[PDB]
mmCIF file with all atom_site columns, C-alpha atoms and ligand atoms in Angstrom:
data_model
loop_
_atom_site.group_PDB
_atom_site.id
_atom_site.type_symbol
_atom_site.label_atom_id
_atom_site.label_alt_id
_atom_site.label_comp_id
_atom_site.label_asym_id
_atom_site.label_entity_id
_atom_site.label_seq_id
_atom_site.pdbx_PDB_ins_code
_atom_site.Cartn_x
_atom_site.Cartn_y
_atom_site.Cartn_z
_atom_site.occupancy
_atom_site.B_iso_or_equiv
_atom_site.pdbx_formal_charge
_atom_site.auth_seq_id
_atom_site.auth_comp_id
_atom_site.auth_asym_id
_atom_site.auth_atom_id
_atom_site.pdbx_PDB_model_num
ATOM   1   C  CA  . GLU X 1 1   ? 86.776  126.013 84.512  1.00 0.00 ? 76  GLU X CA  1
ATOM   2   C  CA  . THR X 1 2   ? 88.825  128.969 85.629  1.00 0.00 ? 77  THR X CA  1
ATOM   3   C  CA  . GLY X 1 3   ? 91.893  127.266 84.185  1.00 0.00 ? 78  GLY X CA  1
ATOM   4   C  CA  . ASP X 1 4   ? 95.227  126.583 85.900  1.00 0.00 ? 79  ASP X CA  1
ATOM   5   C  CA  . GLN X 1 5   ? 95.948  128.982 88.705  1.00 0.00 ? 80  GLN X CA  1
ATOM   6   C  CA  . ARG X 1 6   ? 99.122  131.039 88.581  1.00 0.00 ? 81  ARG X CA  1
ATOM   7   C  CA  . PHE X 1 7   ? 100.323 131.775 92.116  1.00 0.00 ? 82  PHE X CA  1
ATOM   8   C  CA  . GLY X 1 8   ? 103.653 133.486 92.601  1.00 0.00 ? 83  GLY X CA  1
ATOM   9   C  CA  . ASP X 1 9   ? 106.053 131.807 90.183  1.00 0.00 ? 84  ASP X CA  1
ATOM   10  C  CA  . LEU X 1 10  ? 104.103 128.578 90.422  1.00 0.00 ? 85  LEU X CA  1
ATOM   11  C  CA  . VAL X 1 11  ? 101.227 126.944 88.606  1.00 0.00 ? 86  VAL X CA  1
ATOM   12  C  CA  . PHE X 1 12  ? 98.595  124.680 90.124  1.00 0.00 ? 87  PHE X CA  1
ATOM   13  C  CA  . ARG X 1 13  ? 96.464  122.216 88.222  1.00 0.00 ? 88  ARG X CA  1
ATOM   14  C  CA  . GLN X 1 14  ? 93.641  120.420 90.010  1.00 0.00 ? 89  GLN X CA  1
ATOM   15  C  CA  . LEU X 1 15  ? 93.769  116.738 89.055  1.00 0.00 ? 90  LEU X CA  1
ATOM   16  C  CA  . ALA X 1 16  ? 90.945  115.496 91.235  1.00 0.00 ? 91  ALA X CA  1
ATOM   17  C  CA  . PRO X 1 17  ? 88.638  116.790 93.951  1.00 0.00 ? 92  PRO X CA  1
ATOM   18  C  CA  . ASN X 1 18  ? 91.369  116.327 96.509  1.00 0.00 ? 93  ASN X CA  1
ATOM   19  C  CA  . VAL X 1 19  ? 94.536  116.383 94.395  1.00 0.00 ? 94  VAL X CA  1
ATOM   20  C  CA  . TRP X 1 20  ? 96.554  119.116 92.740  1.00 0.00 ? 95  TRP X CA  1
ATOM   21  C  CA  . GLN X 1 21  ? 99.684  119.115 90.671  1.00 0.00 ? 96  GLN X CA  1
ATOM   22  C  CA  . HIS X 1 22  ? 102.148 121.784 91.700  1.00 0.00 ? 97  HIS X CA  1
ATOM   23  C  CA  . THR X 1 23  ? 104.537 123.172 89.061  1.00 0.00 ? 98  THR X CA  1
ATOM   24  C  CA  . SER X 1 24  ? 107.643 125.322 89.404  1.00 0.00 ? 99  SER X CA  1
ATOM   25  C  CA  . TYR X 1 25  ? 110.009 126.374 86.644  1.00 0.00 ? 100 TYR X CA  1
ATOM   26  C  CA  . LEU X 1 26  ? 113.698 126.872 86.107  1.00 0.00 ? 101 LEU X CA  1
ATOM   27  C  CA  . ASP X 1 27  ? 114.666 129.054 83.184  1.00 0.00 ? 102 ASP X CA  1
ATOM   28  C  CA  . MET X 1 28  ? 117.801 127.512 81.749  1.00 0.00 ? 103 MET X CA  1
ATOM   29  C  CA  . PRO X 1 29  ? 119.344 129.590 79.004  1.00 0.00 ? 104 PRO X CA  1
ATOM   30  C  CA  . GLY X 1 30  ? 119.091 127.626 75.768  1.00 0.00 ? 105 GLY X CA  1
ATOM   31  C  CA  . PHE X 1 31  ? 116.460 125.238 77.174  1.00 0.00 ? 106 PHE X CA  1
ATOM   32  C  CA  . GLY X 1 32  ? 113.703 127.714 77.961  1.00 0.00 ? 107 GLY X CA  1
ATOM   33  C  CA  . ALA X 1 33  ? 111.728 127.186 81.172  1.00 0.00 ? 108 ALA X CA  1
ATOM   34  C  CA  . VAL X 1 34  ? 111.936 123.647 82.584  1.00 0.00 ? 109 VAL X CA  1
ATOM   35  C  CA  . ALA X 1 35  ? 108.926 122.438 84.529  1.00 0.00 ? 110 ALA X CA  1
ATOM   36  C  CA  . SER X 1 36  ? 109.051 120.340 87.656  1.00 0.00 ? 111 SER X CA  1
ATOM   37  C  CA  . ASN X 1 37  ? 105.828 118.737 88.940  1.00 0.00 ? 112 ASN X CA  1
ATOM   38  C  CA  . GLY X 1 38  ? 104.786 117.410 92.368  1.00 0.00 ? 113 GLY X CA  1
ATOM   39  C  CA  . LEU X 1 39  ? 101.498 116.695 94.183  1.00 0.00 ? 114 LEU X CA  1
ATOM   40  C  CA  . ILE X 1 40  ? 99.293  118.235 96.807  1.00 0.00 ? 115 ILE X CA  1
ATOM   41  C  CA  . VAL X 1 41  ? 96.781  115.888 98.389  1.00 0.00 ? 116 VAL X CA  1
ATOM   42  C  CA  . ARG X 1 42  ? 93.991  116.975 100.728 1.00 0.00 ? 117 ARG X CA  1
ATOM   43  C  CA  . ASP X 1 43  ? 93.209  114.126 103.063 1.00 0.00 ? 118 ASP X CA  1
ATOM   44  C  CA  . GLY X 1 44  ? 90.431  114.994 105.506 1.00 0.00 ? 119 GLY X CA  1
ATOM   45  C  CA  . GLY X 1 45  ? 91.701  117.779 107.740 1.00 0.00 ? 120 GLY X CA  1
ATOM   46  C  CA  . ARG X 1 46  ? 95.304  117.643 106.508 1.00 0.00 ? 121 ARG X CA  1
ATOM   47  C  CA  . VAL X 1 47  ? 97.415  118.216 103.399 1.00 0.00 ? 122 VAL X CA  1
ATOM   48  C  CA  . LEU X 1 48  ? 100.123 115.853 102.141 1.00 0.00 ? 123 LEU X CA  1
ATOM   49  C  CA  . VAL X 1 49  ? 102.838 116.927 99.776  1.00 0.00 ? 124 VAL X CA  1
ATOM   50  C  CA  . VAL X 1 50  ? 104.769 115.014 97.179  1.00 0.00 ? 125 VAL X CA  1
ATOM   51  C  CA  . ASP X 1 51  ? 108.037 116.711 96.302  1.00 0.00 ? 126 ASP X CA  1
ATOM   52  C  CA  . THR X 1 52  ? 109.375 120.236 96.538  1.00 0.00 ? 127 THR X CA  1
ATOM   53  C  CA  . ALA X 1 53  ? 109.776 122.897 93.925  1.00 0.00 ? 128 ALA X CA  1
ATOM   54  C  CA  . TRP X 1 54  ? 113.230 123.547 92.402  1.00 0.00 ? 129 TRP X CA  1
ATOM   55  C  CA  . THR X 1 55  ? 114.159 125.951 95.193  1.00 0.00 ? 130 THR X CA  1
ATOM   56  C  CA  . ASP X 1 56  ? 113.368 126.822 98.809  1.00 0.00 ? 131 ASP X CA  1
ATOM   57  C  CA  . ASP X 1 57  ? 111.656 130.055 97.796  1.00 0.00 ? 132 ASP X CA  1
ATOM   58  C  CA  . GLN X 1 58  ? 109.330 128.321 95.331  1.00 0.00 ? 133 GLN X CA  1
ATOM   59  C  CA  . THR X 1 59  ? 108.714 125.761 98.051  1.00 0.00 ? 134 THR X CA  1
ATOM   60  C  CA  . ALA X 1 60  ? 107.629 128.529 100.428 1.00 0.00 ? 135 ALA X CA  1
ATOM   61  C  CA  . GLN X 1 61  ? 105.164 129.649 97.736  1.00 0.00 ? 136 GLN X CA  1
ATOM   62  C  CA  . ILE X 1 62  ? 103.667 126.167 97.596  1.00 0.00 ? 137 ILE X CA  1
ATOM   63  C  CA  . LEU X 1 63  ? 103.086 126.446 101.352 1.00 0.00 ? 138 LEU X CA  1
ATOM   64  C  CA  . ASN X 1 64  ? 101.530 129.915 100.926 1.00 0.00 ? 139 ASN X CA  1
ATOM   65  C  CA  . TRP X 1 65  ? 99.256  128.602 98.177  1.00 0.00 ? 140 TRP X CA  1
ATOM   66  C  CA  . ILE X 1 66  ? 98.060  125.752 100.431 1.00 0.00 ? 141 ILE X CA  1
ATOM   67  C  CA  . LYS X 1 67  ? 97.350  128.145 103.313 1.00 0.00 ? 142 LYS X CA  1
ATOM   68  C  CA  . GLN X 1 68  ? 95.459  130.584 101.109 1.00 0.00 ? 143 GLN X CA  1
ATOM   69  C  CA  . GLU X 1 69  ? 93.723  128.144 98.762  1.00 0.00 ? 144 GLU X CA  1
ATOM   70  C  CA  . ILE X 1 70  ? 93.127  125.093 100.952 1.00 0.00 ? 145 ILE X CA  1
ATOM   71  C  CA  . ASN X 1 71  ? 93.539  126.489 104.477 1.00 0.00 ? 146 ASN X CA  1
ATOM   72  C  CA  . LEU X 1 72  ? 94.486  123.131 106.044 1.00 0.00 ? 147 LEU X CA  1
ATOM   73  C  CA  . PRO X 1 73  ? 97.753  122.230 107.804 1.00 0.00 ? 148 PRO X CA  1
ATOM   74  C  CA  . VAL X 1 74  ? 100.538 120.309 106.045 1.00 0.00 ? 149 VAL X CA  1
ATOM   75  C  CA  . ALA X 1 75  ? 101.093 117.057 107.955 1.00 0.00 ? 150 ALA X CA  1
ATOM   76  C  CA  . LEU X 1 76  ? 104.010 115.839 105.843 1.00 0.00 ? 151 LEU X CA  1
ATOM   77  C  CA  . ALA X 1 77  ? 105.993 115.819 102.637 1.00 0.00 ? 152 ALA X CA  1
ATOM   78  C  CA  . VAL X 1 78  ? 107.489 112.920 100.715 1.00 0.00 ? 153 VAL X CA  1
ATOM   79  C  CA  . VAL X 1 79  ? 110.444 113.374 98.395  1.00 0.00 ? 154 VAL X CA  1
ATOM   80  C  CA  . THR X 1 80  ? 110.806 110.916 95.467  1.00 0.00 ? 155 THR X CA  1
ATOM   81  C  CA  . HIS X 1 81  ? 114.536 111.128 94.879  1.00 0.00 ? 156 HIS X CA  1
ATOM   82  C  CA  . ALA X 1 82  ? 117.582 113.130 95.799  1.00 0.00 ? 157 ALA X CA  1
ATOM   83  C  CA  . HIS X 1 83  ? 117.914 115.791 93.107  1.00 0.00 ? 158 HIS X CA  1
ATOM   84  C  CA  . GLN X 1 84  ? 117.166 119.536 92.982  1.00 0.00 ? 159 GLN X CA  1
ATOM   85  C  CA  . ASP X 1 85  ? 113.706 119.248 91.378  1.00 0.00 ? 160 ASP X CA  1
ATOM   86  C  CA  . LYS X 1 86  ? 112.288 116.798 93.970  1.00 0.00 ? 161 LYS X CA  1
ATOM   87  C  CA  . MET X 1 87  ? 114.398 117.726 97.034  1.00 0.00 ? 162 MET X CA  1
ATOM   88  C  CA  . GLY X 1 88  ? 115.358 121.409 96.518  1.00 0.00 ? 163 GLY X CA  1
ATOM   89  C  CA  . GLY X 1 89  ? 112.954 123.058 98.965  1.00 0.00 ? 164 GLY X CA  1
ATOM   90  C  CA  . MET X 1 90  ? 113.832 120.821 101.928 1.00 0.00 ? 165 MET X CA  1
ATOM   91  C  CA  . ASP X 1 91  ? 114.922 123.759 104.087 1.00 0.00 ? 166 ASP X CA  1
ATOM   92  C  CA  . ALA X 1 92  ? 111.616 125.534 103.473 1.00 0.00 ? 167 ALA X CA  1
ATOM   93  C  CA  . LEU X 1 93  ? 109.757 122.436 104.576 1.00 0.00 ? 168 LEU X CA  1
ATOM   94  C  CA  . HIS X 1 94  ? 111.913 122.164 107.703 1.00 0.00 ? 169 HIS X CA  1
ATOM   95  C  CA  . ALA X 1 95  ? 111.531 125.857 108.506 1.00 0.00 ? 170 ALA X CA  1
ATOM   96  C  CA  . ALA X 1 96  ? 107.764 125.334 108.322 1.00 0.00 ? 171 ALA X CA  1
ATOM   97  C  CA  . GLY X 1 97  ? 107.845 122.456 110.812 1.00 0.00 ? 172 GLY X CA  1
ATOM   98  C  CA  . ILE X 1 98  ? 106.672 119.890 108.268 1.00 0.00 ? 173 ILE X CA  1
ATOM   99  C  CA  . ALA X 1 99  ? 107.695 116.273 108.797 1.00 0.00 ? 174 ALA X CA  1
ATOM   100 C  CA  . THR X 1 100 ? 109.729 115.157 105.780 1.00 0.00 ? 175 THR X CA  1
ATOM   101 C  CA  . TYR X 1 101 ? 110.201 111.649 104.404 1.00 0.00 ? 176 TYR X CA  1
ATOM   102 C  CA  . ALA X 1 102 ? 112.475 110.150 101.760 1.00 0.00 ? 177 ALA X CA  1
ATOM   103 C  CA  . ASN X 1 103 ? 113.844 106.756 100.795 1.00 0.00 ? 178 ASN X CA  1
ATOM   104 C  CA  . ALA X 1 104 ? 116.620 105.910 103.287 1.00 0.00 ? 179 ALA X CA  1
ATOM   105 C  CA  . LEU X 1 105 ? 118.984 105.763 100.304 1.00 0.00 ? 180 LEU X CA  1
ATOM   106 C  CA  . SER X 1 106 ? 117.894 109.237 99.180  1.00 0.00 ? 181 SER X CA  1
ATOM   107 C  CA  . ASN X 1 107 ? 118.830 110.396 102.649 1.00 0.00 ? 182 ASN X CA  1
ATOM   108 C  CA  . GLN X 1 108 ? 122.182 108.598 102.356 1.00 0.00 ? 183 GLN X CA  1
ATOM   109 C  CA  . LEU X 1 109 ? 122.901 110.094 98.915  1.00 0.00 ? 184 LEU X CA  1
ATOM   110 C  CA  . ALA X 1 110 ? 121.776 113.608 99.889  1.00 0.00 ? 185 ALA X CA  1
ATOM   111 C  CA  . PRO X 1 111 ? 125.070 114.993 101.224 1.00 0.00 ? 186 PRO X CA  1
ATOM   112 C  CA  . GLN X 1 112 ? 126.892 114.002 98.016  1.00 0.00 ? 187 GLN X CA  1
ATOM   113 C  CA  . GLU X 1 113 ? 124.172 115.571 95.891  1.00 0.00 ? 188 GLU X CA  1
ATOM   114 C  CA  . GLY X 1 114 ? 124.621 118.769 97.886  1.00 0.00 ? 189 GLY X CA  1
ATOM   115 C  CA  . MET X 1 115 ? 121.260 118.591 99.614  1.00 0.00 ? 190 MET X CA  1
ATOM   116 C  CA  . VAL X 1 116 ? 119.454 118.316 102.911 1.00 0.00 ? 191 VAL X CA  1
ATOM   117 C  CA  . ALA X 1 117 ? 118.277 114.899 103.997 1.00 0.00 ? 192 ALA X CA  1
ATOM   118 C  CA  . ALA X 1 118 ? 114.642 114.533 105.001 1.00 0.00 ? 193 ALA X CA  1
ATOM   119 C  CA  . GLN X 1 119 ? 113.947 114.083 108.736 1.00 0.00 ? 194 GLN X CA  1
ATOM   120 C  CA  . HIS X 1 120 ? 112.752 110.520 108.331 1.00 0.00 ? 195 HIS X CA  1
ATOM   121 C  CA  . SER X 1 121 ? 113.878 107.551 106.261 1.00 0.00 ? 196 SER X CA  1
ATOM   122 C  CA  . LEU X 1 122 ? 111.553 105.191 104.459 1.00 0.00 ? 197 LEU X CA  1
ATOM   123 C  CA  . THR X 1 123 ? 112.578 101.550 104.107 1.00 0.00 ? 198 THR X CA  1
ATOM   124 C  CA  . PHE X 1 124 ? 111.087 99.077  101.677 1.00 0.00 ? 199 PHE X CA  1
ATOM   125 C  CA  . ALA X 1 125 ? 110.306 95.386  101.844 1.00 0.00 ? 200 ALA X CA  1
ATOM   126 C  CA  . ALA X 1 126 ? 111.560 92.841  99.302  1.00 0.00 ? 201 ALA X CA  1
ATOM   127 C  CA  . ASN X 1 127 ? 108.388 93.293  97.301  1.00 0.00 ? 202 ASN X CA  1
ATOM   128 C  CA  . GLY X 1 128 ? 109.080 97.026  97.005  1.00 0.00 ? 203 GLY X CA  1
ATOM   129 C  CA  . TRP X 1 129 ? 106.328 98.256  99.292  1.00 0.00 ? 204 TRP X CA  1
ATOM   130 C  CA  . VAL X 1 130 ? 107.251 100.675 102.062 1.00 0.00 ? 205 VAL X CA  1
ATOM   131 C  CA  . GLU X 1 131 ? 107.393 99.320  105.611 1.00 0.00 ? 206 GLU X CA  1
ATOM   132 C  CA  . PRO X 1 132 ? 104.297 100.786 107.266 1.00 0.00 ? 207 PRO X CA  1
ATOM   133 C  CA  . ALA X 1 133 ? 106.246 101.560 110.462 1.00 0.00 ? 208 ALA X CA  1
ATOM   134 C  CA  . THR X 1 134 ? 108.546 103.925 108.523 1.00 0.00 ? 209 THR X CA  1
ATOM   135 C  CA  . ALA X 1 135 ? 105.547 105.719 106.977 1.00 0.00 ? 210 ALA X CA  1
ATOM   136 C  CA  . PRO X 1 136 ? 103.234 106.411 109.905 1.00 0.00 ? 211 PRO X CA  1
ATOM   137 C  CA  . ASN X 1 137 ? 99.811  107.892 109.071 1.00 0.00 ? 212 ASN X CA  1
ATOM   138 C  CA  . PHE X 1 138 ? 100.319 108.240 105.322 1.00 0.00 ? 213 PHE X CA  1
ATOM   139 C  CA  . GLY X 1 139 ? 96.585  108.019 104.696 1.00 0.00 ? 214 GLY X CA  1
ATOM   140 C  CA  . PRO X 1 140 ? 95.867  107.644 100.957 1.00 0.00 ? 215 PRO X CA  1
ATOM   141 C  CA  . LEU X 1 141 ? 99.578  107.830 100.064 1.00 0.00 ? 216 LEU X CA  1
ATOM   142 C  CA  . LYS X 1 142 ? 100.899 104.464 98.958  1.00 0.00 ? 217 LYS X CA  1
ATOM   143 C  CA  . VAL X 1 143 ? 104.675 104.397 98.539  1.00 0.00 ? 218 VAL X CA  1
ATOM   144 C  CA  . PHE X 1 144 ? 106.467 101.897 96.302  1.00 0.00 ? 219 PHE X CA  1
ATOM   145 C  CA  . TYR X 1 145 ? 110.110 101.437 95.466  1.00 0.00 ? 220 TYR X CA  1
ATOM   146 C  CA  . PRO X 1 146 ? 110.291 99.979  91.965  1.00 0.00 ? 221 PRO X CA  1
ATOM   147 C  CA  . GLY X 1 147 ? 114.002 99.336  92.072  1.00 0.00 ? 222 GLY X CA  1
ATOM   148 C  CA  . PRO X 1 148 ? 116.760 101.275 90.359  1.00 0.00 ? 223 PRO X CA  1
ATOM   149 C  CA  . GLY X 1 149 ? 115.768 103.217 87.330  1.00 0.00 ? 224 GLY X CA  1
ATOM   150 C  CA  . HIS X 1 150 ? 116.308 106.809 86.474  1.00 0.00 ? 225 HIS X CA  1
ATOM   151 C  CA  . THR X 1 151 ? 118.207 106.924 89.715  1.00 0.00 ? 226 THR X CA  1
ATOM   152 C  CA  . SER X 1 152 ? 119.036 104.203 92.183  1.00 0.00 ? 227 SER X CA  1
ATOM   153 C  CA  . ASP X 1 153 ? 116.836 105.738 94.907  1.00 0.00 ? 228 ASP X CA  1
ATOM   154 C  CA  . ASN X 1 154 ? 113.772 106.681 92.870  1.00 0.00 ? 229 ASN X CA  1
ATOM   155 C  CA  . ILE X 1 155 ? 110.438 105.925 94.505  1.00 0.00 ? 230 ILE X CA  1
ATOM   156 C  CA  . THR X 1 156 ? 106.864 106.307 93.394  1.00 0.00 ? 231 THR X CA  1
ATOM   157 C  CA  . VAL X 1 157 ? 103.465 107.093 94.894  1.00 0.00 ? 232 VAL X CA  1
ATOM   158 C  CA  . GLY X 1 158 ? 99.851  106.174 94.308  1.00 0.00 ? 233 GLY X CA  1
ATOM   159 C  CA  . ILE X 1 159 ? 96.916  108.060 95.778  1.00 0.00 ? 234 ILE X CA  1
ATOM   160 C  CA  . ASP X 1 160 ? 94.353  105.698 97.249  1.00 0.00 ? 235 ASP X CA  1
ATOM   161 C  CA  . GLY X 1 161 ? 90.803  106.553 96.245  1.00 0.00 ? 236 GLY X CA  1
ATOM   162 C  CA  . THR X 1 162 ? 91.830  108.292 93.030  1.00 0.00 ? 237 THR X CA  1
ATOM   163 C  CA  . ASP X 1 163 ? 92.969  107.070 89.621  1.00 0.00 ? 238 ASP X CA  1
ATOM   164 C  CA  . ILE X 1 164 ? 96.281  108.869 90.074  1.00 0.00 ? 239 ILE X CA  1
ATOM   165 C  CA  . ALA X 1 165 ? 99.826  107.551 90.408  1.00 0.00 ? 240 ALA X CA  1
ATOM   166 C  CA  . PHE X 1 166 ? 103.046 109.507 90.339  1.00 0.00 ? 241 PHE X CA  1
ATOM   167 C  CA  . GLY X 1 167 ? 106.144 107.995 88.817  1.00 0.00 ? 242 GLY X CA  1
ATOM   168 C  CA  . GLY X 1 168 ? 108.572 110.823 89.550  1.00 0.00 ? 243 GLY X CA  1
ATOM   169 C  CA  . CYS X 1 169 ? 111.544 111.086 87.202  1.00 0.00 ? 244 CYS X CA  1
ATOM   170 C  CA  . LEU X 1 170 ? 111.299 107.351 86.394  1.00 0.00 ? 245 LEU X CA  1
ATOM   171 C  CA  . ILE X 1 171 ? 108.443 107.559 83.847  1.00 0.00 ? 246 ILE X CA  1
ATOM   172 C  CA  . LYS X 1 172 ? 108.628 109.632 80.722  1.00 0.00 ? 247 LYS X CA  1
ATOM   173 C  CA  . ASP X 1 173 ? 105.715 110.674 78.616  1.00 0.00 ? 248 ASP X CA  1
ATOM   174 C  CA  . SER X 1 174 ? 104.218 108.432 75.962  1.00 0.00 ? 249 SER X CA  1
ATOM   175 C  CA  . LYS X 1 175 ? 105.779 110.428 73.165  1.00 0.00 ? 250 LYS X CA  1
ATOM   176 C  CA  . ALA X 1 176 ? 109.141 111.101 74.748  1.00 0.00 ? 251 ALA X CA  1
ATOM   177 C  CA  . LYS X 1 177 ? 112.075 110.732 72.309  1.00 0.00 ? 252 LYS X CA  1
ATOM   178 C  CA  . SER X 1 178 ? 114.478 109.427 74.972  1.00 0.00 ? 253 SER X CA  1
ATOM   179 C  CA  . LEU X 1 179 ? 114.909 108.645 78.671  1.00 0.00 ? 254 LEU X CA  1
ATOM   180 C  CA  . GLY X 1 180 ? 116.927 111.820 79.082  1.00 0.00 ? 255 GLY X CA  1
ATOM   181 C  CA  . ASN X 1 181 ? 119.704 111.890 81.636  1.00 0.00 ? 256 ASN X CA  1
ATOM   182 C  CA  . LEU X 1 182 ? 121.216 108.503 82.395  1.00 0.00 ? 257 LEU X CA  1
ATOM   183 C  CA  . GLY X 1 183 ? 124.190 109.486 84.596  1.00 0.00 ? 258 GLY X CA  1
ATOM   184 C  CA  . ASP X 1 184 ? 122.664 107.993 87.771  1.00 0.00 ? 259 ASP X CA  1
ATOM   185 C  CA  . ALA X 1 185 ? 120.536 105.527 85.832  1.00 0.00 ? 260 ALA X CA  1
ATOM   186 C  CA  . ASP X 1 186 ? 120.736 101.777 86.187  1.00 0.00 ? 261 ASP X CA  1
ATOM   187 C  CA  . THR X 1 187 ? 120.341 100.923 82.542  1.00 0.00 ? 262 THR X CA  1
ATOM   188 C  CA  . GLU X 1 188 ? 120.049 97.193  82.914  1.00 0.00 ? 263 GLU X CA  1
ATOM   189 C  CA  . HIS X 1 189 ? 117.177 97.380  85.470  1.00 0.00 ? 264 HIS X CA  1
ATOM   190 C  CA  . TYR X 1 190 ? 115.383 100.462 84.128  1.00 0.00 ? 265 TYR X CA  1
ATOM   191 C  CA  . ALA X 1 191 ? 112.800 98.614  82.029  1.00 0.00 ? 266 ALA X CA  1
ATOM   192 C  CA  . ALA X 1 192 ? 111.829 96.233  84.844  1.00 0.00 ? 267 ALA X CA  1
ATOM   193 C  CA  . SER X 1 193 ? 111.682 99.088  87.261  1.00 0.00 ? 268 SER X CA  1
ATOM   194 C  CA  . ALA X 1 194 ? 109.131 100.893 85.029  1.00 0.00 ? 269 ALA X CA  1
ATOM   195 C  CA  . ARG X 1 195 ? 107.023 97.777  84.583  1.00 0.00 ? 270 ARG X CA  1
ATOM   196 C  CA  . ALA X 1 196 ? 107.209 97.195  88.351  1.00 0.00 ? 271 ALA X CA  1
ATOM   197 C  CA  . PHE X 1 197 ? 105.758 100.653 88.901  1.00 0.00 ? 272 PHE X CA  1
ATOM   198 C  CA  . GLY X 1 198 ? 102.997 99.828  86.435  1.00 0.00 ? 273 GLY X CA  1
ATOM   199 C  CA  . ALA X 1 199 ? 102.209 96.610  88.277  1.00 0.00 ? 274 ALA X CA  1
ATOM   200 C  CA  . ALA X 1 200 ? 102.394 98.314  91.657  1.00 0.00 ? 275 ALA X CA  1
ATOM   201 C  CA  . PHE X 1 201 ? 99.562  100.702 90.739  1.00 0.00 ? 276 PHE X CA  1
ATOM   202 C  CA  . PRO X 1 202 ? 97.627  98.556  88.277  1.00 0.00 ? 277 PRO X CA  1
ATOM   203 C  CA  . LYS X 1 203 ? 94.429  100.655 88.500  1.00 0.00 ? 278 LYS X CA  1
ATOM   204 C  CA  . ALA X 1 204 ? 95.856  104.142 88.033  1.00 0.00 ? 279 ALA X CA  1
ATOM   205 C  CA  . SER X 1 205 ? 94.613  105.622 84.762  1.00 0.00 ? 280 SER X CA  1
ATOM   206 C  CA  . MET X 1 206 ? 96.368  109.000 85.277  1.00 0.00 ? 281 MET X CA  1
ATOM   207 C  CA  . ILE X 1 207 ? 100.122 109.049 85.529  1.00 0.00 ? 282 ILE X CA  1
ATOM   208 C  CA  . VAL X 1 208 ? 101.544 112.329 86.793  1.00 0.00 ? 283 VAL X CA  1
ATOM   209 C  CA  . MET X 1 209 ? 105.196 112.856 85.901  1.00 0.00 ? 284 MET X CA  1
ATOM   210 C  CA  . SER X 1 210 ? 108.028 115.151 86.815  1.00 0.00 ? 285 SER X CA  1
ATOM   211 C  CA  . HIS X 1 211 ? 108.548 117.216 83.657  1.00 0.00 ? 286 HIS X CA  1
ATOM   212 C  CA  . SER X 1 212 ? 105.369 116.935 81.554  1.00 0.00 ? 287 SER X CA  1
ATOM   213 C  CA  . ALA X 1 213 ? 101.574 116.990 81.710  1.00 0.00 ? 288 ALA X CA  1
ATOM   214 C  CA  . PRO X 1 214 ? 99.706  114.022 83.171  1.00 0.00 ? 289 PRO X CA  1
ATOM   215 C  CA  . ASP X 1 215 ? 99.564  111.086 80.750  1.00 0.00 ? 290 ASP X CA  1
ATOM   216 C  CA  . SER X 1 216 ? 97.810  107.713 80.539  1.00 0.00 ? 291 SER X CA  1
ATOM   217 C  CA  . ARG X 1 217 ? 99.326  104.260 81.176  1.00 0.00 ? 292 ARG X CA  1
ATOM   218 C  CA  . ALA X 1 218 ? 100.847 104.552 77.702  1.00 0.00 ? 293 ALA X CA  1
ATOM   219 C  CA  . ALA X 1 219 ? 103.598 106.538 79.447  1.00 0.00 ? 294 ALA X CA  1
ATOM   220 C  CA  . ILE X 1 220 ? 104.629 103.476 81.413  1.00 0.00 ? 295 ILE X CA  1
ATOM   221 C  CA  . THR X 1 221 ? 104.633 101.117 78.442  1.00 0.00 ? 296 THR X CA  1
ATOM   222 C  CA  . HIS X 1 222 ? 106.446 103.697 76.289  1.00 0.00 ? 297 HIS X CA  1
ATOM   223 C  CA  . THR X 1 223 ? 109.115 104.205 78.965  1.00 0.00 ? 298 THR X CA  1
ATOM   224 C  CA  . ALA X 1 224 ? 109.585 100.452 79.487  1.00 0.00 ? 299 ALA X CA  1
ATOM   225 C  CA  . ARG X 1 225 ? 109.987 99.867  75.752  1.00 0.00 ? 300 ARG X CA  1
ATOM   226 C  CA  . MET X 1 226 ? 112.584 102.611 75.372  1.00 0.00 ? 301 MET X CA  1
ATOM   227 C  CA  . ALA X 1 227 ? 114.411 101.214 78.353  1.00 0.00 ? 302 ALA X CA  1
ATOM   228 C  CA  . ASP X 1 228 ? 114.385 97.718  76.782  1.00 0.00 ? 303 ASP X CA  1
ATOM   229 C  CA  . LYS X 1 229 ? 116.707 99.155  74.120  1.00 0.00 ? 304 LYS X CA  1
ATOM   230 C  CA  . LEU X 1 230 ? 119.444 99.765  76.733  1.00 0.00 ? 305 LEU X CA  1
ATOM   231 C  CA  . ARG X 1 231 ? 119.791 96.154  77.979  1.00 0.00 ? 306 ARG X CA  1
HETATM 232 ZN ZN1 . ZN  I 2 .   ? 116.327 113.306 88.858  1.00 0.00 ? 405 ZN  I ZN1 1
#
């Protein structure tokens, strides 16, 4: 109604009464500006964050936006995989005293990827759901590890009480021409891993993704079908 708010170098798009997409950009000569998306979730008297911005500085701006726009404390942040777009503002989260969580494997891979591990490790049961003891007080955040896909550590998040689920860098948009960068990809499991995500949040009608605008469930089926062509 007032459109998408520009704050610092960042853009915020309200997806639901309690949920916002946060967006930061990296201008890569020859590619133009590349968007990275994450979530902000107001749960009662606290805010929960999914992913960082590309950099620590942009991640500090997310925190400033929350303080100024929502004025509630940030209880915790979850990072979807170990890569710059999801994990790049870890130091800013630490400096702010925010409890950080990532897949235990993300935390294992972090040093190699040249990044800072989150404070806490999430572990997942055989059915892919996070062990509740490793994710204390996650509220509406439901964390699912679909298996190896775009990376081996990629996880995914639904928001209880909304129609939203977030597939991270695993799901591409319904018109995407390719699955993009496969260097860390497990190409034989990728398709199953996408369908697993779909089945893990069967009710979500809005799929937020890393690099593009929110899409419908078509994004999941499109991604799965492209990934079928690799196996
Ligand atoms: Zn990635």
